[PDB]
RNA sequence: AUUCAUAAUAACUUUUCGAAUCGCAUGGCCUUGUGCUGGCGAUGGUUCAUUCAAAUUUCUGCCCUAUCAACUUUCGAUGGUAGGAUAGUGGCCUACCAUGGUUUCAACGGGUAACGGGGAAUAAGGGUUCGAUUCCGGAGAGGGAGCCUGAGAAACGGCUACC
RNA sequence: GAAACUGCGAAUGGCUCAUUAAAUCAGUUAUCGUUUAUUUGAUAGUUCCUUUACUACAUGGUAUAACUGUGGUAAUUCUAGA
């Protein structure tokens, strides 16, 4: 009531962030920016929590003001920056790059990646209006407005966006048979290639995918990320790649690989 | 009943505690600003012309100029008036205030000498309090001195020096709005942010106009065709 | 003699503190959580960086004795020690000293008798002089 | 799905914005003038997106009571048209016009030792009882009402009046 | 680097459960019916009342706090004259 929330109450954050359930009444609200609050991860659970770069959020406060944290090719000097889905995290230091992905169980895996294809991302294309003096742009996942796009990216297309300048390398259509990525849902983390896409005009476009493993499932198109065709994704992939193990073989595998 | 007299060419004040209320009758009913002859408050006032500007009474509830009332009202006071100092942004409050009417009620009149007298005063006139500071502006100090449009401000800027038990320093304020390589090197740099921005918004409208007829030449070359 | 034995764990390089993270675990037997000063000394020449810049914190010693488990920072100089450490840290290890401030109490009661005055108050405290005297 | 985005024409305005701001390094050039171009930033600023939101809003769902069966409609009750007002839709308010609207499938009224929910206790199964209270949502700051500043308050560790 | 102007925040948090029985609220919708500081991204060559009446841009102006001095009230985070 009566204004903007500034506070984010522990057992109130994503469960996706892992945040400890005690030992702290509050979590790390994240600030305004790129992504949203519950589909976002901040730079201080990112350091403290997934890299244990920092102890504590001072430590945090005093990686992040001496430009060693790097968000999209920027800074970004914020305590509770919202980083998100395929932002690429640069750090000077220790020469490695992180591209903000999700692992098969749905929460941000920590994914070590090179110089060269952190130069990019890829951004869903949100909408396609004409701006003023009749300008045509695209806006992506993140918020980035990009002048001039190509005439034929259309809405949930995807842009390879240049990341150094806001320039458009490539896109990628919607189309059926080429890999996506699911972004939201209990099937958050999967992989896999689309069977079709069935309209519903009116609202709620549901899509059909098909993982490598000739598993289906459905899901809403908001939660459809396009990645590639079949095979070669435009990034590279994380340990799992989205294959959803279940619980019986996911025990079988673990049994096997610490039973020596 | 004290009497705060001022002198505002010279600057100084003083407390006149001034008894025998036929003395003081000229100044009752009278308002604040306009003048009241000292031939009747003092002996030594001859030639002096008081102008009323302001003062308190008893209870410390100060004279506000407006009011037409010989007595004390309550007023909501809003920001910018006297009287009255905001400690929100945006917060009002209701004060009493002592009219501007001067009556026996006052316990001390606040006064303006805009006319010296035959006479000369034992505080007032004969002390004149140095300025506190001189300007601060470049322009300022110009219409301070009067030099020229095209001159130099850097060695005529008033200098204080102050003693610290054994050394001694001078300083003197820092100049504002003064024309610096710094203040022209931010200006150009502005207008040429403005003229880059224009030419590479125009390239990338030249570039993409070139796509739009290129695409239209490739739809209209299949739809002739097939 | 007695096999202190102090052994690191889970070590990892933080250039971004400019630091090693790691675990200390004691083996101890028959003694009882030997130091910080003396496992501080132990990891600066099993290291070789410095005493100043070596921080030690946690230790929570098992049940039964004989072992007590922590963790352990050394730092690639004592010049940039002092600047990621916390202050009540340096003060554990000397390398700094508690502000003997004033209790929390009096600053807050000393920030609302300032806020009651508009200013710098010489010339309130000049006149309520005068006052009450003449 | 649009009178949408956007563009064009004719004008309009107590003309909005369109950098008179700050830091570091202070380079390069030739008409060597304290001349011309020049980096990395910070703070401002129009508009559009995004984020944090807010407000409004669709369906379905709430305890006991008929010794509560009719209620609402002067003085908006239900709706139409036009306006006003609002950030905006809307009887939200006004003018005119129509006579509607709800209800035994429990309206309206009364009671609540009622804030709602996630949940809690117990239990074979079904159930019964509780939920002021660690999270989410709402309301309030003795009781009302009104209002300034602000993007956001009818704010009370803001104000104004009354009790 | 005090103080005081300026900016920002003080509308979050915290407490309580008195109101409140299609009201709140839960799940689910909608804004093609709106506002949105901050963040992020994008973005302004046109600044002449009627140009054949532009006005310093090597940069317009006053008007004030803090500060100096003179006070009033018994008393308040009261303030008045210069
Ligand atoms: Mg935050
Ligand atoms: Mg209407
Ligand atoms: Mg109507
Ligand atoms: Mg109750
Ligand atoms: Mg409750
Ligand atoms: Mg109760
Ligand atoms: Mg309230
Ligand atoms: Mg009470
Ligand atoms: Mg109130
Ligand atoms: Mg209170
Ligand atoms: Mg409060
Ligand atoms: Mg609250
Ligand atoms: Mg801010």
Redesign the pocket.
Known sequence: ???????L?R??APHHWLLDKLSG?YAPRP????????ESLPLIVFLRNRLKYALNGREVKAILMQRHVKVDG?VRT?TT??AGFMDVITLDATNENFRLVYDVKGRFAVHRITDEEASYKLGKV??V??????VP?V?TH??????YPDPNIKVNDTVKIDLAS?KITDFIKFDAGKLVYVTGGRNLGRIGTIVHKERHDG??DLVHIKDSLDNTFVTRLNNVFVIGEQGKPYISLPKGKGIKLSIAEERDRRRAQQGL | M?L?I?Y?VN?????FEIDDEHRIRVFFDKRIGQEVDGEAVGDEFKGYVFKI???????????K?GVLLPTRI?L?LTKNV????P?????????SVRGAIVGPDL??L???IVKKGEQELEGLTDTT?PK??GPK????I??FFGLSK?DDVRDFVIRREVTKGEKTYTKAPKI??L?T??????????R?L??R??????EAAAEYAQLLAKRLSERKAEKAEI | SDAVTIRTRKVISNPLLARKQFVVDVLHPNRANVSKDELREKLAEVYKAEKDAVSVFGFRTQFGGGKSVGFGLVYNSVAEAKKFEPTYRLVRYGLAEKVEKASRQQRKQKKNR???????????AK?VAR?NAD
Do not use: W
């Open positions: 009531a009566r204004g903007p929330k500034k506070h109450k057992l109130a009444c600030s305004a920016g790129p992504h949203k609050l519950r920027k914020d920056y919202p949100k909408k209006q004409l701006g003023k003096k009749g742009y806006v993140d918020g980035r407005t990009i002048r806001g609202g709620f | 004290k705060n001022s505002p600057g100084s004040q003083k407390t500007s302001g003062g308190n009474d008893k209870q410390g509830f100060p004279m100029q309550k909501l006297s009287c009255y100092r400690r929100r942004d945006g917060e009002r409050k209701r004060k316990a001390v606040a006064l303006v309090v506190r500071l502006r470049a322009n300022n110009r219409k095209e504002q709005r024309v390589p710094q203040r022209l090197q931010r200006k150009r740099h502005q040429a403005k003229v921005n224009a030419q590479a918004q125009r | 300032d806020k009651k005055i508009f200013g710098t108050g010489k010339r309130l006149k006052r």
